């Protein structure tokens, strides 16, 4: 479900970079959503994944996110991610 998180992004005024903005709660029941809301087909020189406003609950949810940033880095892109400490906090 996307019930408990929401993925937004924006392009950079080039088109060459993309940052992609998760909030709210990552549990494995919404794995397949969570990988939806990324198109790792776009022509890309770098993603950001910013999950400093989300929660990992498990770790079926950072193995999607690892997933997600394996996914961008296959299709050409450097990526990083932003706010994984305060997002692992809660991954119990």
Do not use: C, P
Not at 61 to 67: P, R
Not at 71 to 80: D, H, M, N, S, T
Request: aromatic share 10%.
């Amino acid at each position: 479900s996307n019930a408990l998180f929401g993925v937004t992004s924006e392009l950079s005024k080039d088109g060459r970079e993309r940052i992609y903005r998760v909030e709210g709660q990552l549990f494995y029941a919404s794995v397949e959503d969570f990988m939806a809301a990324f198109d790792f087909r776009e022509a890309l020189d770098r993603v950001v994944i910013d999950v400093s406003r989300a929660h990992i609950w498990d770790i079926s949810s950072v193995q999607a996110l690892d997933m997600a940033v394996l996914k961008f880095r296959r299709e050409g892109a450097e990526v990083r991610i932003v706010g994984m400490n305060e997002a692992s906090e809660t991954m119990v």
